[PDB]
Design a protein around this ligand. Structure first.
Ligand code: ATP
Ligand code: KVR
Length: 337
């Protein structure tokens, strides 16, 4: 609603509407649809493919309004549009088409050639965005209808399995809508209107989003199994590669606080390659899927060391000790976050 129409698009909008309408009757003839008097899908002969004048003026207006909304959403996409030159409209080349491919209309709908016209990756990305929004407005119209999703298509029960996000939509519709959208935006370029898109933005979730406010879960051995002397080894296999920590915690570790943030636990975050105890340092490399990190503690001279896939992880210095010295205290137990 907030979108205002610039004067160039304003006085070119009717030509856009009619040319894309003719372009659609070209898409129809390419798909094999032929022109007829009456609206009956079985007979494949409809007045829809004939020129807009013989088209029902209701559908013709509804198509033009649909394009007004589509170009307004294009402008809402943050993409600026600039007319190239007046001569790009003064000379309007138009491929000739075979009579079987060509409509009864004398002048060929086919605008300046798609070979000459070029599509950038950003332009294709905004084509995808526009296809997304068109399906959204198609769906909201259905919700106003009261149609609700159904795996089986139903008209009496108004259950369309096409009421899913465009990401999960079936290929055939995605292709047909994409074709009309991208040939439309290519006609936009061929009219000299250059669509300079906004810069692509990068954002990272970093596992902030979570079901339930809880950010992480800690699994540990029982307190009674604490080891106060000897040399011990246990493995941790990482099915994924994310915010995961493994190491040894005291029987006083808190299940709400992250490992290594306090003095209770000594952990290794392979995600950021950091050893964690009362802070973070740099230690080791980053793991991948199906990586086995073995944690080893020798409580005799108070050392702890980690081996990712067998090789010994190292800090910035060549030392193999993740934590050089620590008090025995009340023992250590295997712990993971
Ligand atoms: N003959 C046409 N002329 C113009 N645009 C059309 C035409 N057919 C389809 N469209 C466009 O493509 C969309 C396809 O909607 P369509 O009515 O085919 O969906 P549907 O799944 O059959 O709907 P419902 O859920 O009500 O059964 C329309 O919203 C419109 O934008
Ligand atoms: C530019 O505007 C138009 C004008 C005409 C047509 C399309 C888009 C493309 N679309 C594709 C499509 C197919 C199935 C569904 C559906 O059943 O959900 C929705 C859209 C309708 C077929 S011709």
């Amino acid at each position: 609603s907030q979108i205002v129409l610039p004067p160039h698009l304003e006085r070119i909008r009717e030509k856009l509407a009619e040319n894309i309408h003719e372009l659609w009757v070209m898409n129809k003839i390419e798909l094999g649809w032929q022109y007829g008097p009456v609206r009956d899908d079985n007979k494949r002969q409809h007045p829809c493919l004939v020129e807009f004048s013989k088209l029902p003026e209701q559908e013709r207006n509804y198509n033009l309004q649909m394009s007004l909304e589509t170009l307004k959403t294009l402008l809402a996409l943050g993409c600026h549009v600039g007319i190239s030159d007046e001569h790009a409209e003064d000379k309007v080349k138009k491929m000739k088409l075979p009579k079987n491919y060509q409509l009864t209309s004398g002048y060929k709908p086919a605008p300046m050639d798609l070979s000459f016209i070029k599509l950038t990756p950003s332009q294709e990305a905004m084509v995808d965005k526009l296809a997304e929004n068109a399906h959204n407005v198609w769906a909201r119209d259905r919700i106003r209808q009261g149609w609700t999703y159904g795996i089986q298509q139903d008209v009496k029960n108004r259950r369309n399995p096409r009421l899913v996000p465009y990401t999960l939509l079936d290929d055939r519709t995605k292709k047909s809508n994409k074709d009309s959208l991208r040939e439309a935006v290519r006609t936009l370029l061929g009219y000299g209107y250059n669509l300079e898109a906004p810069d692509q933005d990068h954002a990272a979730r970093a596992e902030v989003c979570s079901g339930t406010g809880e950010r992480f879960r800690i699994f540990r051995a029982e307190k009674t199994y604490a080891v106060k002397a000897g040399r011990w080894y246990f493995e941790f296999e990482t099915v994924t590669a994310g915010d995961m920590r493994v190491g040894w915690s005291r029987p006083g570790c808190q299940p709400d606080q992250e490992l290594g943030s306090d003095e209770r636990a000594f952990a290794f975050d392979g995600f950021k390659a950091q050893r964690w105890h009362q802070g973070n340092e740099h230690y080791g490399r980053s793991w991948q899927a199906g990586d086995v990190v073995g944690c080893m503690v020798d409580m005799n001279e108070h050392t702890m060391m980690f081996t990712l896939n067998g090789e010994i992880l190292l800090d910035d210095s060549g030392s193999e000790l993740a934590f050089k010295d620590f008090d025995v205290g009340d023992g250590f137990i295997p712990v993971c976050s």
